[PDB]
C-alpha cells in the first residue's frame, strides 16, 4: 500500500533507494578480490572458494607507524602487479604502495596541490596528473603554457572515446599528451550570481560552422625530462583521436578525422622523431565515419591487430597486418553505402546483425579475443578464435538484459555484471572456456520490496517507414483498471548515442517514471530510429534533418497509445531534457492537436547554437545545410504553441548555452505565444545533487495543473 | 457592452486609447502659440481671440528654396526669442532657425552624426550635445575621454533631481558641464542573447556600501575653446548637485551633499578660475536631507535669491540674501528635527501642510514668485509677493486635481493643464493676477466613451500609526453586486518619490487596473508611508528598514477588505513593479495567511544589490546598518512562501540587476520553496513597446489562473 517518494525515487533523495552492491570488485592476476569496509577478501574463480587476504585494522596498525594517515573503507584499493604481493591506494591526495603479505609500506609519493585526472602507471611507478591547464609528471611539470592552452587533458568536447589526454606507452617509459589551443574559440560568458557583485564565468564554446579548436599530440620522456610533438602539419580543422601505442613504444598510431568527419585515416608516427611513418587504412561515408576505439595489438603477435569499425552497418572487429602502410592498397565499397582502402590481408573477425560494444581483453593461451556484443535488447560475453574466427556461441542465444564485464589477466574468468526487467543486479565469476558461471558473488533483492509499484510492459511498434520495428517500454499504476481513462506522459530522448529502452532491470524505467506511473498517468518511451545499438542503418537514417523521422517515430508510438481504449487521447503530455528537450519542443511545435502540456528541459532550440564536433557529424555546416538548419530551428515555429510548455534551463550549462532557451523566449514574446520558463542556478546541464528532487517536484507539479 | 482590450488600454498596443491634447503648447514672450499638423496660430491670453501665424506650406517652400529639407507637423517648433520673430525647428539633425515675418531661413547648423542630449541657448546660438562618453559644444569636442569617463551627461544615477550634465550660463558665454569618472565602479555584466554567440554587455553599477564614482564640474568658454574646472578638493565620496549660475556668470553655485546624505552645502565657485568662494548656507537631518532644486535669483533684484527647502517639514520657498557667506553665521534646530547653518536675513515666503511642487517662474513688475502646490490629492498654482510674503489665496480653496503649469515671459498668463477624477484633460489660459481662466483651449472628452467601465471610489484609512490618513483607490466591475463575492487584487508601489492615488484622471488607475476590474476582480491601491506629496514626517518613517512599515499598512488596507462583505477574504491577490516587486515578494513572505497569488517585476531582493546613491539614503550602509539589511532581505524569509509567487525580470534591466531575481531563486530551490519565473530578453527595467500587452496577457493569465 506504500507508495515511494521523491525522496527515495530520484538521486540527490535523502533516502534513496538503490540494488545492493559490490564495490571495488577486481582482478589480482587470476585471483578475484572482494573488498569491503572491514576485510579484503579473495575469491579462487574455479572453485568460488572465499580466502581472506587482509582486514582494514592490519593496514590502519602499519599506516600509524608510517605517520601515513588512515583508511576508512577498502574499497578505493587497486591491484595493478599479476606478480607482486602490493596495493595502491590514496589517503588525502598521497599515493601509497602496500605489501600485504609482509605487512610494509614499499613507496609514498604525493603530487602537487590540486592535482586531477592522475594517471598512474604500474610498469614504470609514474604518474602523471594536471594542474590547472599544465600537465606535470612525478615532481616536474612537462609544460608551462598560458590560458587558452590546456595540456595532457581530454580534447574535441569529447567525441571520438577521448575521455583523458594522457597516454602511457606500454613499458611506462613514454608519455603520449594532447595540447589544445583553444584562443580562436569564441567565449561564452556564464554569470556567477553568489559573487558579491554578479560576475562573468566565460567558457569556450565552438558553434556549428564557426573557428575550432587546435589539437597537437607531445610525446614526453621522464628520463629526459624533454617532449616532442608529432609533425602532422597545419591541425586546423582535423581531429586527432583514439592515440594507442606500438608494443614496442617506437611508434604512435592514431585515427585522423577531417572536419566533415566523412575521411577517417589510421596514421603511424615515430615516437622519437614525431615524423609521420604513412597511413594503414582509410575508411569514408557519404553522410559520417565516428572512430571511437583505439586499435589493439595481438598479445601474441605485435604484427597484427585489430580494428574495430561499423563500415558494414554494425561495429565489428577486423584483424589487419602491422605492415599494412607498406603494401598495396585497393578502395572497396562497404555494405553501409562507404567506402575504404584497404592494404594486406583483412579479416573480419565477427559478424551478423549485432555489435561489439566492448573489447575485454585476451586469452592468451587460446589465442582468442573475449568481448561483450549488443541488439537492442539484448547482450552478452562472447569469445572468438583469432587464427580461425570460431565464435564461442551465435548472438542469437542471447537474453533480453544488460551485460557488463571485467577479464582476469590471463583472459581465463571475468566479473559478470548483469541485470534483467525483475534482477536488479547479479555478478557472477564466469569461466571464458565455456562461458559457464562458476560462483554467484551477488543476486541483489529488490530495493522497492514492500512498496506499491507499477506495471512495466515491453513490446515493438513499426517506424514511421513502415519496416524498422521499434521497442517500447508502457507503464501503468498498480491498481490499473482497463475500464477507466488514463492521461499519458511520454518520456523522450530519441537522439544519438543513446538507448533508453534497455533488457536490464524494469526495462530502463527512471525514477520519476515510477513516480508519475504510481501518481495515476501512464508512462511511455519508444526508442526511434537515431538512437543507439541497433547499427548504423537505424542510427543516420536522420542525417542532416536532426528531430524530423525522430518525431514522426515518436507519433506512431502516440498513434499506438490512442489505439488503446485506456488512453485519454486528450491528455497526453510530453517530457525530456538535452536531445530530449529539443523533441518536447519540436512535438509541441510540429503537432500541436497531439501533445497537450510539455516539459523540456537544458533543450537545443537553434542547432547553430550548438558545438562543432556532434553538431556537424549530424548536420554538416549551416553554409552546407541552410535548409535542415531552418527547419530544425525552433525559434522558426514559436507562432505554432498552443498548449503549455516549460522550459527549464540550467544557468552554468556548458554542453547547451542558456541562449538557447532565452532567445526561444524572445521569439514567443514577438510571436505572442506564452510558454513558461525556469533557471536553476549554479548548475550545469544537468541538475545533481538534493536539488534534483526540487525539479521533479516542479515537473511534477507542471503536469498535476495542466494535464 | 462592450470592454475595452489590452491593446487599447496598454500603452505599447495597436489601438492604445488616450484623451486628445495640444502638442506644443507653449509661449512667445505674451503671446500663446499653438501649433498644429498643418498651421501655426498665436492666441491673445487677455481675450482666447485665435490669429493665424504661419502654414506648414509656407514653411516648406522656403526650406525647399534652400534644400534644408521638409516638415511633417509644426508640434516640434520652438520660439526661444521674446522680441525676434524666429522659430526654431529640428529637420534630419539639423537646426533651422526661421523669420516668420519675412519667411527667410535665418541659419542652419548640423551637429556631427550620432549627436544626443543636445541643449540649445538662443541668447548665444550655442549649442551643446554628446557624442557617445565626450562633449561637444557647436562644431568642437570641449573632451577626448576614454572608456570610463563620461562627459555632459546626467551623474549620481539621476539623483538630487539632475536630469542632464550641461548647464548654460544666463547669456550663453559659458557651459557648466560634469565629468564623471566610473573606472572604478563594479561593471555588472549583462548579456545579448541576439547576438551570433551571446556577448557580454557590461554597464557600470555601484553597489550599496562598495566604492562610487567621482564626479568634477568644467566650465567651458566656447569663444576661447578652453575648459576649467572647479577646484573642490578630493571628490571620493561626494555629491556635486544643483548647479546654477550667478545672474552676471562671475560665479557658480551648486549643493554638495556628503556620502552618508545627511548634510548638505550650498557652495559658490569662481566662473573665472574655479576657485571656491565660501559656503552660504547648511543643512543637516539625523536620517537624511534632499536637495532636488537649484536656487532661482530675483530676476528684479540679484543680491537675493530663493531657496528650495523641508527644513520645516514640507518643501517650502526661502529668500536668502547673497551675500550670506561673508556674514555671521548661526546654528538652528529645524522643524523636521534636524538644524541648519544661516547667515544673514532669511524669510519664509510660503508655509503650510503642503509643498511647492515647482518654481513656475516670476511676474517681475508685481515682484511675485508664481509656483505649483501639492499635499495628497489636491494641486494648485499661486503667487506669492516676495517683499511682503502675501500669497494669492489659502492652499485650503484647492480641489482634488493635477494641475501642471507653463509661465508667460512677463508672468501675467499660465498655461493650465490639468485633469480631475472624471475630466480626463483641460487646458486653460490663466490671468497670475486674480488666477481666474481667461480662455477654455482644450476639454478633452472621455476617450472610452461607449465602452463599459468599471466603478472608482476613492477614501481614507488610518496608517499602521493609528494617526496618519491614508488614500485608497477601490474599482469595482461595472455589473457590481453587494450580494455577491469577489477576488481582490492590490495593486502596490509604496516606495519614495511615487504617489499612485491622485486627484487627477481616474484617480491614478492604470490600463490593466481597468482590465481586471471588467473582468470580475475588485482593484484595491493604498499610498502608504512612505509614498510622496504628503511632507517628509510621513516620507521618513521607513527610515532604515524599508519595506517594513509599508507592509504593516498594505495589511491596514486588507483589514479594511475583510471588512466588506461582498470581498472574499480568501482571494486576495497582489502585484507591483520595483519597489512594488519587493513589496509583492514581502508581503507573500511576511503575510502568507493572507495573499493567495502574487506578481512582482523587476524587483529589489536585497537592498545590497541595489545603488548607492537612493539605497544608502533610506537604508544607510550595510556596515551602519547591518539589522536593517539582514530584516529588508527577502532570501532570508525564502523558506516561508506558501502561495503562487511570479517572479518576471528583464534580462537588460540596469536599475535592478537580474541577480536579485535569480539569486532569490536559488535561495528558494535550496529552502524547497517553489515560485515561478519569467524573463524578458531585450528589455530595460520595464517592458515598452508591443510586448508591454504580452507583459500584461502574462499577468492576467496567471491571477486567471490561481485567484
Ligand atoms: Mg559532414
Ligand atoms: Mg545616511
Redesign the interface.
Same mark, same amino acid.
Given at each position: 500500500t506504500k507508495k515511494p517518494t521523491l525522496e527515495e525515487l530520484i538521486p540527490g533523495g535523502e533516502s534513496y533507494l538503490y540494488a545492493e552492491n559490490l564495490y571495488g570488485l577486481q582482478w589480482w592476476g587470476d585471483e578475484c578480490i572482494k573488498p569491503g569496509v572491514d576485510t579484503l577478501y579473495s575469491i579462487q574463480p574455479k572453485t568460488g572458494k572465499e580466502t581472506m587476504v587482509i582486514t582494514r585494522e592490519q593496514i590502519n596498525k602499519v599506516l600509524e607507524e608510517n605517520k601515513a594517515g588512515k583508511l576508512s573503507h577498502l574499497y578505493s584499493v587497486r591491484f595493478p602487479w599479476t606478480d607482486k604481493a602490493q596495493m595502491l591506494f590514496t589517503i588525502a591526495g598521497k599515493f601509497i604502495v602496500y605489501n600485504f603479505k609482509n605487512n610494509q609500506v614499499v613507496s609514498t609519493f604525493k603530487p602537487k596541490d590540486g592535482a586531477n585526472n592522475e594517471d598512474y602507471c604500474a610498469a614504470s611507478g609514474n604518474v602523471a596528473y594536471t594542474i590547472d591547464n599544465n600537465l606535470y609528471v612525478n615532481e616536474k611539470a612537462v609544460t608551462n603554457e598560458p590560458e587558452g592552452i590546456v595540456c595532457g587533458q581530454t580534447v574535441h568536447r569529447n567525441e571520438f572515446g577521448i575521455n583523458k589526454g594522457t597516454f602511457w606507452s606500454p613499458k611506462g617509459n613514454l608519455l603520449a599528451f594532447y595540447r589544445m589551443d583553444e584562443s580562436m574559440v !569564441?567565449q561564452?560568458?556564464l $554569470?556567477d550570481? !553568489?559573487a =558579491?557583485?554578479?560576475? +562573468?564565468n566565460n567558457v569556450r564554446?565552438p558553434?556549428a560552422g564557426?573557428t575550432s579548436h587546435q589539437v597537437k599530440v607531445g610525446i614526453y620522456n621522464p628520463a629526459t625530462g624533454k617532449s616532442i610533438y608529432l609533425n602532422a602539419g597545419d591541425p586546423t580543422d582535423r581531429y586527432f583521436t583514439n592515440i594507442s601505442w606500438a608494443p614496442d613504444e617506437k611508434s604512435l598510431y592514431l585515427i585522423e578525422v577531417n572536419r566533415d568527419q566523412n575521411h577517417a585515416k589510421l596514421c603511424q608516427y615515430n615516437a622519437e622523431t614525431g615524423e609521420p611513418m604513412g597511413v594503414l587504412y582509410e575508411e569514408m561515408h557519404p553522410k559520417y565515419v565516428e572512430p571511437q576505439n583505439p586499435i589493439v595489438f595481438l598479445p601474441w603477435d605485435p604484427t597484427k591487430f585489430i580494428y574495430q569499425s561499423q563500415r558494414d552497418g554494425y561495429n565489428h572487429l577486423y584483424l589487419f597486418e602491422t605492415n599494412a602502410a607498406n603494401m598495396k592498397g585497393e578502395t572497396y565499397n562497404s555494405a553501409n553505402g562507404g567506402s575504404y582502402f584497404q592494404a594486406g590481408k583483412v579479416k573480419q573477425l565477427t559478424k551478423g546483425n549485432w555489435l561489439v560494444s566492448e573489447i575485454l581483453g585476451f586469452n592468451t593461451k587460446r589465442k582468442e579475443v573475449i568481448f561483450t556484443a549488443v541488439e537492442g535488447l539484448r547482450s552478452g560475453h562472447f569469445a572468438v578464435n583469432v587464427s580461425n574466427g570460431k565464435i564461442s556461441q551465435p548472438f542469437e542465444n542471447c537474453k533480453e538484459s544488460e551485460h557488463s564485464g571485467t577479464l582476469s589477466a590471463s583472459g581465463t574468468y571475468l566479473i559478470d555484471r548483469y541485470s534483467t526487467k525483475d534482477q536488479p543486479r547479479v555478478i557472477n565469476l564466469v569461466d571464458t572456456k565455456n562461458f559457464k558461471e562458476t560462483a554467484n558473488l551477488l543476486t541483489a533483492e529488490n530495493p522497492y520490496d514492500g512498496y506499491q509499484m507499477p506495471s512495466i510492459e515491453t513490446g515493438t511498434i513499426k517506424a514511421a517507414d513502415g519496416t524498422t520495428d521499434l521497442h517500447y517500454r508502457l507503464m501503468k499504476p498498480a491498481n490499473f483498471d482497463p475500464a477507466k481513462k488514463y492521461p499519458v506522459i511520454v518520456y523522450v530522448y530519441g537522439g544519438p548515442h543513446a538507448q533508453c529502452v534497455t533488457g536490464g532491470w524494469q526495462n530502463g524505467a527512471r525514477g520519476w517514471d515510477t513516480y508519475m506511473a504510481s501518481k495515476g498517468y501512464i508512462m511511455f518511451t519508444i526508442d526511434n530510429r537515431g538512437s543507439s545499438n541497433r547499427g548504423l542503418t537505424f542510427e543516420n537514417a536522420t542525417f542532416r534533418r536532426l528531430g524530423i523521422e525522430e518525431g514522426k517515430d515518436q507519433v506512431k508510438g502516440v498513434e499506438f497509445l490512442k489505439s488503446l481504449p485506456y488512453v485519454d487521447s486528450e491528455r497526453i503530455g510530453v517530457h525530456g531534457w538535452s536531445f530530449g528537450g529539443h523533441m518536447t519542443t519540436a512535438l509541441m511545435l510540429r503537432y500541436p492537436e497531439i501533445f497537450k502540456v510539455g516539459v523540456a528541459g537544458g533543450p537545443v532550440i537553434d542547432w547553430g547554437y550548438y558545438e562543432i564536433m556532434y553538431g556537424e557529424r549530424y548536420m554538416d555546416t549551416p553554409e552546407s545545410n541552410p535548409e535542415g538548419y531552418k527547419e530544425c530551428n525552433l525559434k522558426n515555429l514559436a507562432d505554432q504553441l498552443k498548449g503549455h510548455l516549460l522550459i527549464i534551463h540550467d544557468?552554468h550549462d556548458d554542453t547547451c $548555452?542558456?541562449?538557447h532557451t532565452?532567445?526561444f523566449?524572445?521569439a514567443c +514574446?514577438?510571436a =505572442?505565444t506564452?510558454p513558461?520558463?525556469?533557471?536553476?542556478?549554479?548548475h550545469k546541464h544537468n541538475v545533481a545533487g538534493r536539488?534534483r528532487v526540487?525539479l521533479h517536484?516542479?515537473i511534477t =507539479?507542471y503536469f498535476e495543473?495542466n494535464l
Open positions: !569564441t561564452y560568458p $554569470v550570481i !553568489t =558579491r557583485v554578479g560576475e +562573468v564554446y558553434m564557426m544557468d $548555452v542558456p541562449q532565452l532567445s523566449m524572445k +514574446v514577438d =505572442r506564452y513558461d520558463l525556469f533557471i536553476y542556478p549554479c536539488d526540487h517536484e516542479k =507539479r495543473q
